[PDB]
Symmetry: C3
């Protein structure tokens, strides 16, 4: 395992149906090895000077770090918002056969 | 995008109502760009030798890394418990215009 | 605070009753200081040429970075999976007495 060669990316979505469309497509396209959907989130941020509280879904995405720029761009291309929240945090350690799988199921088309 | 220059911080609150109040507060004060609250969490740890399980709310907060010290101090004050659990993890990549927006709505 | 001396590990489990026995066991063995269980996740991934969506529980475990291999070995020895997902992310900043507490309850 090379530290930092896998990453967990977060993306938030307006509802569960868009989240699952997008989760299903990143995996079909091999941009990611798996996606965990966390429903029922409440997002709180400022917009147009006012504080909003939206009902959302958070996606946690496991992919190779070298693929996050293509993941992200795919995300921008389909996402309802027009500035989509994508962040990716490096995996330093883990289950060595899990990490390998992430690499396998996501490499070389 | 400068790697490491935005962090995602995670904070555990005893219930929705305090979590929402803190989340509102840190965003109004521009200590954070946005906060995701995740309800119906269960936390398990040792207390004075013995396993507990609490019912809580986990907050994920995005903000500039150089702001992590003040957010944490804000969270410490404001308080229910004595030791506030805040950890921040470095964001290495992501959607540039989004990360740019984080830096601007918390800017200096 | 030594940056990256604490880690946040994510483990995905089939249900609440499994995540909970593992959660209790890692805390008890002092492989971890604190575990949060996030219920009601959907996992999406390709298996056998098609998309699977399973109903699952995500655990988030705070512990000493130096303890992750022993954490991971234990998780793998008790976990129904057959390739359990365990990933760890370095905690670069946060609440120093909290982080000191993570180290004390898992002390070497």
């Amino acid at each position: 395992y090379v530290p930092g060669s896998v990453s967990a990316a977060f993306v938030t979505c307006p509802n569960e149906k868009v989240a699952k469309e997008i989760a299903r497509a990143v995996v079909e396209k091999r941009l990611a090895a798996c996606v965990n959907l966390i429903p029922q989130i409440t997002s709180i941020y400022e917009w147009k000077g006012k504080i909003e509280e939206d009902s959302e879904v958070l996606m946690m995405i496991k992919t190779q770090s070298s693929l996050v720029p293509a993941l992200t761009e795919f995300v921008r291309s389909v996402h309802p918002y027009e500035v989509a929240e994508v962040i990716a945090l490096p995996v330093e350690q883990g289950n060595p056969p899990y990490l390998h799988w992430v690499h396998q199921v996501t490499e070389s088309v």
